[PDB]
Design a protein around this ligand. Structure first.
Ligand SMILES: Nc1ncnc2c1ncn2[C@@H]1O[C@H](COP(=O)(O)OP(=O)(O)OP(=O)(O)O)[C@@H](O)[C@H]1O
Ligand SMILES: [Mg+2]
Lengths: 39, 466, 487, 67
């Protein structure tokens, strides 16, 4: 049972970041402003 | 990416790329070359230049030739149909029998299996050969040194190991031909076709052949062992088999690495070997292991240069060896086959914690009795063969019956000799030698313990002497 | 489990971005990366490559930085970005490492998750000076009769295990690690010994089986294993001993007692020779660099014994050296003999002749020695050593044969000091001078079982007192004579 | 905090997996059968799911009186 659990977890992790594989720079500008504050 | 050759110095070739540099250990293919010339990246010199070593002849290379990058180190065709088939470092068929229509290609230069993938219990690989499974047992995922020569039959021992491991277990075999003489390679090909290990007309071949001959550049002779290792790793990691990988000489692997590092301009070390001798041997031998998926057991013929066992090449190879079989010509002159020297053959798994106290004690007793027989032999050289000791001649005949019982008919030698090939399980070997040590088979004559299987065949023969 | 992912791995995920200092790889090759940039990088500072690899800033040059790559240079290309870490090369230390198998950089390779270490310690620290140290006094018990009697090892010592291949050096170290279980489970916290086993250039299967032997004996719970095996990069096999030594210096500095095994130092010297020759440095004897002595001596000098003003801790080192054909007058063997405090010569003649452990008593020495024995072991082992010297001189003779067969021992069988003292007593007072030799071991076995099954009180008194008093002397005398009458 | 609201959408997608035990694979099974094969093979060699029934054997004995 624990080995099946670990292997299902592994396939889930590579599938979730395959999901990101299939998938807006407002955060980029925000980080820019933050770094500008970092002087 | 596509680069251009900017330097050709013997077997090293410096290429220059415009946009995408290939990483180290990557196969570049030269364009326009009539054959398939493959360079392997060994260095990044800067200025977008890349130093490589060629896997073939470099004649006719022009500064400016187009060199196309592949992306993978070197991809050889792996699959269940490389068996009974010859290929070279690049993975192309050598045997003039058509292409290898396999399904997948594996890259050479893999990583040794992780720590957590190592199986942790030492286990004997039963080979069905009496003298080996009794006195110097092979370990699963181990390395074995064949200290044989030409006179004593060594090709027969190799073919019989292939046959047994294929039958007892379900394991296929790979034979790497590092730095091998083309004449001897052809001889071995035809001997393995004859003895049925290779089948030219069926799909029942038990061995895949990989050869890097002596007329090939140091890069080839250095990567051919890795090619064989890759075609064995496929079987292990994708079929759960217990593969048997032979390396017809490991010293030529070492010396080819030495030549390669010399060509690249590196400063030599003790005696002249590469500075990376230990790591180059390790990155290869560490892939011959027993993983949780299967195992690869390696039989590596060893040449000892200048007969110095402290030379850096055999002294760095012996760090990886787990067993050792010595094919003496002296034992063969006595008429014993396989001519494995029972006293000079060693194994690291011989201790009672691994093979059990029963196996350990039977083998220890056989060893001690053989040593005492050679002692009583040099004292019989007195020419005064008498029996002022009852136990002395008792043990003399016991040990003669033993050292003849360490003889066995091999299946692969069933066409040359009418004797049938009798592979014997481990427990039957232990039991038979236990009986002969307990003094039971005294009434039996001597020659009924010659070219026999288990003791059942021995007593059947003894009866049939009349 | 699903939320073992969104656990904090997402929320707490270091998804920061910071103004980092960088360099650009000019040329990777021979395990060295010429890197352009890194203007403010420090000498011996750890940098991180684009592939997640790590390296040490060796050569600060005017126009570039030479970086030693801790891993395969296959994963580095020209043009890769190299970030500073601002930290001189250091490893995680602490008690959270006990039970863990790690590689030379402190990363777990046992699949049990990350090491929860809170402290980091530099790998290239300087050994303690003259004042912080104090002479070796406390015994470091190995559980091997031959070692614990004739070649005693104290806490804070450096004792070489030198010998050919396959002569039982790793077995001696593994038994020394297993033997500390009787102390680590007890009550006195000044007798606990935390063991560290650095495996350099070894077969990874051998290290896995070693961890198995330690787990079956329940010795992993107090043991760190640093593994830089045969297939790992030469810089990693170079670094592994200093990583292990810092993990042990953590215990040495906090009033605890560590033991460290380097298995072996010959392979670290070979890895350093590879690195030096690839750096085009001038090769000396046997092509070794000029500073291979410094290589081993700055390492074995950190195994000290602090005084009670610096915590009172210690760190014992058992470096292993493999000789070729029994040559001890080689370069690296004599270097480490110059560094350590003694040797344990294992012989191939003795090992092949069934004498295991194959310790050469005439050549094994311990410069500290007597100052770190118990009183009872001293009482019996003095006479044993005198009689063994007498026997090797004339090679009484029967007494010597009896004693040398009394020194044989089994693998994975470390004896407590009381039982070693009992056996050596039964051997050294003559009580088997007339028993023919081949039964001795048998007798020994039976005898000790007797003494442990029924006379536990005598052994307990020996344990409490440390010496074998006249009362206990006559008691053990009647015990052994009664058994011999029974035997 | 754009990438957390990235990730947990994907995590919820992966959660839609009671209809498919291993999240739309039709692969990674060919090796799981082999790995469990080894697993069962040497964890035992019987119907490990079951409870065991036990055959016992009892000692040998001989003539021990004065012959
Ligand atoms: N004290 C002992 N008693 C009996 N047998 C022993 C003893 N020590 C070792 N052996 C046996 O001899 C073998 C030697 O193995 P060991 O690892 O201890 O030697 P080594 O010096 O480390 O050789 P290597 O260089 O290969 O590591 C052991 O596997 C074991 O089977
Ligand atoms: Mg060892």
């Amino acid at each position: 049972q624990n080995m099946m659990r670990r292997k299902e977890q592994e396939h889930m992790i590579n599938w979730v970041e395959k999901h990101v594989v299939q998938s807006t720079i407002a955060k980029c500008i925000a980080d820019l402003k933050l770094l500008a504050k970092k002087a | 990416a596509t680069g251009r050759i900017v330097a050709v110095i013997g077997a090293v070739v410096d290429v220059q790329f415009d946009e995408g540099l290939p990483p180290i250990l990557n196969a570049l293919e030269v364009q326009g070359r009539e054959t398939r010339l493959v360079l392997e990246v060994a260095q990044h010199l800067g200025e977008s230049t890349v130093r490589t070593i060629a896997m073939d002849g470099t004649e006719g290379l022009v500064r400016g030739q187009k060199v196309l990058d592949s992306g993978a180190p070197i991809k050889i065709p792996v699959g269940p149909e490389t068996l009974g088939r010859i290929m070279n470092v690049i993975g192309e068929p050598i045997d003039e029998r058509g292409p290898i229509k396999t399904k997948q290609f594996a890259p050479i230069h893999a990583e040794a299996p992780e720590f957590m993938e190592m199986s942790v219990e030492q286990e004997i690989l039963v080979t069905g050969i009496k003298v080996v499974d009794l006195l110097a047992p092979y370990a699963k995922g181990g390395k074995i040194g064949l200290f044989g020569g030409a006179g004593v039959g060594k090709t027969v021992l190799i073919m019989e190991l292939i046959n047994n491991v294929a039958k007892a277990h379900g394991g296929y075999s790979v034979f790497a031909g590092v730095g091998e003489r083309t004449r001897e390679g052809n001889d071995l090909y035809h001997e393995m076709i004859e003895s049925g290990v290779i089948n030219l007309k069926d799909a029942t071949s038990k061995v895949a052949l990989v050869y890097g001959q002596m007329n090939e550049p140091p890069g080839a002779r250095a990567r051919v062992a890795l090619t064989g290792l890759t075609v064995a790793e496929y079987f292990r990691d994708q079929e759960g088999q217990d593969v048997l990988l032979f390396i017809d000489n490991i010293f030529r692997f070492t010396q080819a690495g030495s030549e390669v590092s010399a060509l690249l301009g590196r400063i030599p070390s003790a005696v002249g070997y590469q500075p990376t001798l230990a790591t180059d041997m390790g990155t290869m031998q560490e892939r011959i292991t027993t993983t949780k998926k299967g195992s690869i057991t390696s039989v590596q013929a060893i040449y000892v240069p200048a007969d110095d066992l402290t030379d850096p090449a055999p002294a760095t190879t012996f760090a990886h060896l787990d067993a050792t079989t010595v094919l003496s010509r002296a034992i063969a002159e006595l008429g014993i086959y396989p001519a494995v020297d029972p006293l000079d053959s060693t194994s690291r798994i011989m201790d009672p914690n691994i093979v059990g106290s029963e196996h350990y004690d039977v083998a220890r007793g056989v060893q001690k009795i053989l040593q005492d027989y050679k002692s009583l032999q040099d004292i019989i050289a007195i020419l005064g063969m008498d029996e002022l000791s009852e136990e002395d001649k008792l043990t003399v005949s016991r040990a003669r019956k033993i050292q003849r019982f360490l003889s066995q008919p091999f299946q692969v030698a069933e066409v040359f000799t009418g004797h049938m090939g009798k592979l014997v399980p481990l427990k039957e070997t232990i039991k038979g030698f236990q009986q002969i040590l307990a003094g039971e088979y005294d009434h039996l004559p001597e020659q009924a313990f010659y070219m026999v299987g288990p003791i059942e065949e021995a007593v059947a023969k003894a009866d049939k002497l009349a | 489990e699903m939320s073992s992912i969104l656990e904090e791995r997402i929320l707490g995920a270091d998804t920061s971005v910071d103004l980092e200092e960088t360099g650009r790889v000019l040329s990777i090759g021979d395990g060295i990366a010429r890197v352009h940039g890194l203007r403010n990088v420090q000498a011996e500072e750890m940098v991180e490559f684009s592939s997640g690899l790590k390296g040490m800033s060796l050569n600060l040059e005017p126009d570039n930085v030479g970086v030693v790559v801790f891993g395969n240079d296959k994963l580095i290309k020209e043009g890769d970005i190299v970030k500073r870490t601002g930290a001189i090369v250091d490893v995680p230390v602490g008690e959270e490492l006990l039970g863990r198998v790690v590689d030379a950089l402190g990363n777990a390779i046992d699949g049990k998750g990350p090491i929860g270490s809170k402290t980091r310690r530099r790998v290239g620290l300087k050994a303690p000076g003259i004042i912080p140290r104090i002479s070796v006094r406390e015994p470091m018990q190995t559980g091997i009769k031959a070692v614990d009697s004739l070649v005693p090892i104290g806490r804070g010592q450096r004792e070489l295990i030198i010998g050919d291949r396959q002569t039982g050096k790793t077995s001696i170290a593994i038994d020394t690690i297993i033997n500390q279980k009787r102390f680590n489970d007890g009550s006195d916290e000044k007798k606990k010994l935390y063991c560290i086993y650095v495996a350099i250039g070894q077969k990874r299967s051998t290290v896995a089986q070693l961890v198995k032997r330690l787990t079956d004996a329940d010795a992993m719970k107090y043991t760190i294993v640093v593994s830089a095996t045969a297939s790992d990069a030469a810089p990693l096999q170079y670094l592994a001993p200093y990583s292990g030594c810092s993990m042990g210096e953590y215990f040495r500095d906090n009033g605890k007692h560590a033991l460290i095994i380097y298995d072996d130092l010959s392979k670290q010297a070979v890895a350093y020779r590879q690195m030096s020759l690839l750096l085009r440095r001038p090769p000396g004897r046997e092509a070794y660099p000029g500073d291979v002595f410094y290589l081993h001596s700055r390492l074995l000098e950190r195994a000290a014994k602090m005084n009670d003003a610096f915590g009172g801790g210690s760190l014992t080192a058992l470096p292993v050296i493999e000789t070729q054909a029994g040559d001890v007058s080689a370069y690296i063997p004599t270097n480490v003999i110059s560094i350590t405090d003694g040797q344990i010569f294992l012989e191939t003649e003795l090992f092949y002749k069934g004498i295991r452990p194959a310790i050469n008593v005439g050549l094994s020495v311990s410069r500290v020695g007597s100052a770190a024995q118990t009183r009872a072991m001293k009482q019996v082992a003095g006479t044993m050593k005198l009689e063994l010297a007498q026997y090797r001189e004339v090679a009484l003779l029967s007494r010597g044969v009896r004693l040398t067969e009394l020194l044989k021992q089994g693998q994975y069988s470390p004896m407590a000091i009381e039982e070693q003292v009992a056996v050596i007593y039964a051997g050294v007072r003559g009580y088997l001078d007339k028993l023919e030799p081949s039964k001795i071991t048998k007798f020994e076995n039976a005898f000790l079982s007797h003494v442990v099954s029924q006379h536990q009180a005598l052994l307990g008194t020996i344990r409490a007192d440390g010496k074998i008093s006249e009362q206990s002397d006559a008691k053990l005398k009647e015990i052994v004579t009664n058994f011999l009458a029974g035997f | 905090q754009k990438l957390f609201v990235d990730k947990i959408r994907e995590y919820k997608s992966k959660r839609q997996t009671s209809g498919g035990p291993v999240d739309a694979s039709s692969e990674y099974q060919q090796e799981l059968e082999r790995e469990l094969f080894k697993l069962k093979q040497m964890f035992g060699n019987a119907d490990m799911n079951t409870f065991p029934t036990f055959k016992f054997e009892d000692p040998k004995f001989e003539v021990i009186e004065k012959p």
